[PDB]
Amino acid sequence: SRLDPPEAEVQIDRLITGRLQSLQTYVTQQLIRAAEIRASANLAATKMS
Amino acid sequence: TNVYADSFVIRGDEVRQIAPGQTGKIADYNYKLPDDFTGCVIAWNSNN
C-alpha cells in the first residue's frame, strides 16, 4: 500500500523467500519428529502385542 | 513472432521514464511500459 509495484515487488519476493524457507524448516522438523513418533508408536504397538 | 515500433518525441528530463516500472507524466499519462517488457528503447537528439 505504500511502495510502487516495480520496487515493492522485490521486497515482496524477499519476504516470500524468507517465509517459504521458514515453512520448509518447519515441515522438515515435523518430518523428523514424525519419524521419531512413528518409531515410538511402533515400539508401543510391539509392547502392546 | 512480431516486432512493434513505438515512435514518439519526448523531452530529456522525461527520457528516463521510458523504461519498465517507471513513474512520471509520460509513464503515467502518455506511454506506460509493462513490468515484463522485452525490447529496446532508442533515443536521439533532434535539435536540428
UniProtKB/Swiss-Prot annotation, chain B:
Q: What result is annotated for mutating residue 25 to N?
A: In strain: Beta/B.1.351, Omicron/BA.1, Omicron/BA.2, Omicron/BA.2.12.1, Omicron/BA.2.75, Omicron/BA.4, Omicron/BA.5, Omicron/BQ.1.1, Omicron/XBB.1.5, Omicron/EG.5.1; May enhance affinity to human ACE2 receptor
What segment(s) does the record annotate as region Integrin-binding motif? 11-13
Function of the molecule: Attaches the virion to the cell membrane by interacting with host receptor, initiating the infection. The major receptor is host ACE2. When S2/S2' has been cleaved, binding to the receptor triggers direct fusion at the cell membrane. When S2/S2' has not been cleaved, binding to the receptor results in internalization of the virus by endocytosis using host TFRC and GRM2 and leading to fusion of the virion membrane with the host endosomal membrane. Alternatively, may use NRP1/NRP2 and integrin as entry receptors.
- The protein's assembly and partners: Binds to host ACE2. RBD also interacts with the N-linked glycan on 'Asn-90' of ACE2. Cleavage of S generates a polybasic C-terminal sequence on S1 that binds to host Neuropilin-1 (NRP1) and Neuropilin-2 (NRP2) receptors. Interacts with host integrin alpha-5/beta-1 (ITGA5:ITGB1) and with ACE2 in complex with integrin alpha-5/beta-1 (ITGA5:ITGB1). May interact via cytoplasmic c-terminus with M protein. May interact (via N-terminus) with host bilirubin and biliverdin, thereby preventing antibody binding to the SARS-CoV-2 spike NTD via an allosteric mechanism.
What is the protein name stated in its UniProt record? Spike protein S1
What is the native source organism of this protein?
A: Severe acute respiratory syndrome coronavirus 2 (2019-nCoV)
Gene that this sequence comes from? S
